[PDB]
Write a protein that binds this DNA or RNA. Sequence first.
RNA 1: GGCUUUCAGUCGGAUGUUUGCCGC
RNA 2: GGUAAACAUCCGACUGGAAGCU
Lengths: 1072, 170
Amino acid sequence: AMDQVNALCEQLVKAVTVMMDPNSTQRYRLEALKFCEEFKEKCPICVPCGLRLAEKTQVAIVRHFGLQILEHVVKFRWNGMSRLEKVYLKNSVMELIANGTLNILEEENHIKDALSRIVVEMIKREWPQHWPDMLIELDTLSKQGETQTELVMFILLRLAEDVVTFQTLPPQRRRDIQQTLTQNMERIFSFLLNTLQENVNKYQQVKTDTSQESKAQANCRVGVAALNTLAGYIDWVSMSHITAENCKLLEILCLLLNEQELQLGAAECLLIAVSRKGKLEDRKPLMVLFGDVAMHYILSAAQTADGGGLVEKHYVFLKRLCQVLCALGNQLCALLGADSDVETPSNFGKYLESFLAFTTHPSQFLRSSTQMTWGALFRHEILSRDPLLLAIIPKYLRASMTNLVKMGFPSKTDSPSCEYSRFDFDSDEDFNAFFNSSRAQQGEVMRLACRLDPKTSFQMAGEWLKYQLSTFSLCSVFSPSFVQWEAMTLFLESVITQMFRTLNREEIPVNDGIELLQMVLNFDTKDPLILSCVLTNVSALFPFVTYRPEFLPQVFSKLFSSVTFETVEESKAPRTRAVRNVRRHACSSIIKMCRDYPQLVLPNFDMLYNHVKQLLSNELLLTQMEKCALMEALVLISNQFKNYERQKVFLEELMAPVASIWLSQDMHRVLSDVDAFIAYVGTDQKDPGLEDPCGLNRARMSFCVYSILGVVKRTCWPTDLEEAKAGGFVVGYTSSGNPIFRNPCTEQILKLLDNLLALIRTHNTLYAPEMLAKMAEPFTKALDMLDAEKSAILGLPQPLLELNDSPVFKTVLERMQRFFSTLYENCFHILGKAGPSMQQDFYTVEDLATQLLSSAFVNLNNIPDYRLRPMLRVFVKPLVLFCPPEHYEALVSPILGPLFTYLHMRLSQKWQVINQRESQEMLEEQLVRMLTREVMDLITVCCVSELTDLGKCLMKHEDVCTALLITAFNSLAWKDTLSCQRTTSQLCWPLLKQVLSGTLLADAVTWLFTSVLKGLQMHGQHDGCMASLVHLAFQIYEALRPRYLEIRAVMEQIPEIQKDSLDQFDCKLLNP
Amino acid sequence: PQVQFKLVLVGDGGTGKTTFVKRHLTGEFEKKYVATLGVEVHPLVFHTNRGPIKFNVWDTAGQEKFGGLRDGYYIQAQCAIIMFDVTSRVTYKNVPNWHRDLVRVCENIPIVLCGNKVDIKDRKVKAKSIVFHRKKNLQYYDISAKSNYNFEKPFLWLARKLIGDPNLEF
RNA sequence: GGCUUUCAGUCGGAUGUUUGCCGC
RNA sequence: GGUAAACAUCCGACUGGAAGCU
Ligand SMILES: Nc1nc2c(ncn2[C@@H]2O[C@H](COP(=O)(O)OP(=O)(O)OP(=O)(O)O)[C@@H](O)[C@H]2O)c(=O)[nH]1
Ligand SMILES: [Mg+2]
């Protein structure tokens, strides 16, 4: 009625050819496609056609399409088939394996696939119960030869994948084949093992025996299949089978690591095996790999990592072997720590020797990889005490020194590593990113190494220093010297800080210490980048001066000279970055020095005082930033007077010029009036590029702000009570009996507070569009974000400008832009720090809260996101958190109330803009995310500890309370998935848990639950939110539905709810 | 014209395989998702520092009911790109499928994995959750056919791999 | 239902390390 | 020195994958 077998085969050949034709009419294509679909659905003689096309004579393309048919029939048409038809199709396909395919070495990989897919498809249709002799049938086919055995391996691996890993079958049918698999798993895995074992053997003697290449090549190909298909089971199957015959499977897999043709397969089996997670006791037998026998083949294969140039085949094996060795160490670390029967392997020395082989190899990738396992080895409760590990650290750190040197670019040719870096990373950018992030992790691991062998680490950091000191825009840049110096510094500094934690007060190489300290001191450079390492090496070595205070002056000399300039050139050329970097770096070391050893710097105080006084004498000489770092340092030494009045007098004298300029009559006007202010700073004016007087003004104002902040941040009573008493710092003691301190800088700072709040208020007012429009067109984005700060928070990276260059010149607009951002943050910083510094002399200030509200919180409606975030973090968070409860009433309450109300309102409106939906807008979306997190965090830290005192306390307030609940439950509706869980689990609940008994205004109850639901509505998709929100929804319907009845009102508006199933649950809780 | 290589493009329906290619060839962005039927082979020429290099790109339809020969298009391929969408979590789940199918039919070919449409508001598939490429030792590049972010990176890497010249420039 | 260890996710907290930026 | 962002080690908050227990 339809067609004859002969006729269809003909068109099917014409259709497969047109489809494979790269250059065929698109129209002929569709008709070919439409032919085949129809054929595969309706044609009753498909199997005769499939078997015909599928036959060895045709072109591979055609054979494959024949086989694809026989697969499509098993897969879509089995149910519309007679028992006889099936038995016929089965026997034909089984015949196909028997001898309907080409022999082994001829025969495309794809045909083996297509034939294989058909068997697997029939196995999944009916393996356990209608096809019981399948395992025997395959076992029979496999004895016929290698072409067959390979085919069986293709099938057992596809079958293992589809049912277990991809599990692509209905749940029910899937489950039964897996149970069957497991039941037969000893048989199946025994079969995989012996196949492998014999095939390898035959390949063994026959390999190098000239007149037998075809059989060596064949027995090999089966090995590869076995290893491949084994790799399908090795991770999922019970550990019984792996361990099976005195662990023969794992033994051979090690032996095969030294056979070039089977290694990658065997490495891949080892890898999966040893990454097997789960029950700790199931991994215990993995320790066999540490055995004498296995370790031998492991080490042998690892020794061949001679690294003699990049051979793609070998290097790819090494990347694999390496991961095997990594996982096997993490296994060891995980099994030992748990004391559970696992005792340190005898052969541990061999594992290490072998691991070290990869640690010292040229390849960046290979070295980086070892790090994590080394980090696990070095923090082991037990293995860091192992002496085989102790023994290995000299060789390890020796490796790390080289690892520290930033050599091996994909583009350059300087070192062996360069070759491989090309294999592994597209560009230098991909290389950098890997390198730098690698070295972060490398950092922590190297410390643990030093912590375990402090003597050696110091000795080798020592010798690398002595070495660097005497070796090697045409002065210095990114030359081999600088790169060598930076790595050397970094190692040493790392080594010394570590040493002064582990070695007792007495094991210190003092003599060798000062030895090096001297050499560093006497060394000399006119080159900024080198000096900058010098300065670091001084600070690293500086704990030595504790023993030999004679050296202090030299130390001061070294640092202060660097502060002043870099004699690249003075008032004639522009300041290069590396120059302004060392100066900053020196000033930094000055603070670190004074902050860390101050009894030490103490005897030398007048001299430093005098020095800094001299340096500031010419107001034009140092940077404001430099000026203040020095003042900061001076403050830090005065902490050591440990005496109130003594410090009181110093600081008032230190601050005496700053007070002058700040409390000045015309400064007051500048600080209070917006027009006075715009004036002082030069946004009023259009020489369209001679800002000149404007700059100096806005630098003096920065100077005061920088100072006030400096003093507040650093001033300190003695940290020892008994001592704090004696210098007259203790004012009395708390109810709980904790001393109450007064701080020497209180009187002085408090005097500057009115002008600060003055400036703060004014600065905030400038953000009004009618104030902002008062700026001149040159400077209209004076108060916008620096393009620096933009690509910053969009993740859009930057190029690295050379430190020997000043190409980016400080634009008049960019100059102001930097000023505003810093002045804004710095003012708030002082207020942030005022609380924890002054204590209850700041908190008890009269009408503080009102002053703060009218200044700091004055113009929020116009204050942007990027300003408010800084404000909250730097100012509000600390103001509140450091407040003694006595005044949660006085000021915390009157401030947080209006703040939370506002913030919440601001955010909801911000979120509705976002819910409404190039770079310029997309950017602002990011700032809403970060602000929201900041706000939620602020709320959490405030009352979550269940609530803190000021949690309880703020709740016992009308406005505060409402604002905390609204905000918290509204958070669930914002599209930021990070806040959902945080707020839900930590915040939403204990808030309601506080306002159970009493007034739960009916309208409030209904809203609360609707808002939790909007949460489930917004998120949904995300497993984190949903679970967490469901539970929270459940807690509200359970503490609130025994009392109120309007909760159910809400439930019934939810799409698809059986009211009957509701009723049943509703009454279940209203009875017992 | 010179060497010429066979390139196989696989992945779920709607991950933008056809649009990625239509771009490279013409240089225009296609908006409507007209479902691909089977395959559409496209030649792409790349004047390198080593001469012109051609790419026969087999744009195979990854819609269940529309792939023609499917596995048959992989026949004698020499490099492949497996593509998925970051809007659809499902498409990254299905990557190991597209992979098993490829290596089985033609083993040892360089494959590049590609997460498309990174220009879309919020990525459901987070850049940190992408680990498959590391377990199967393949290259990855998140990309966009509307944005052109890493537009040529997959071709360049393949080209680099086939010719065995790490310094190869497009 | 009452009490716990192991294994992946989504966070949370605490240290630690690294990389950017800081002439106003 | 300060500030922001990445990663790593450790001890909870819940979703889900094996069991011990009153
Ligand atoms: N925003 C965005 N949309 C894209 C991008 N790439 C593709 N699309 C859209 O995705 C949809 C489908 O793209 P196609 O290329 O047709 O999908 P395909 O891989 O050919 O689908 P199949 O061939 O059937 O597997 C279209 O609606 C395109 O507009 C992208 O990079 N960004
Ligand atoms: Mg397509």
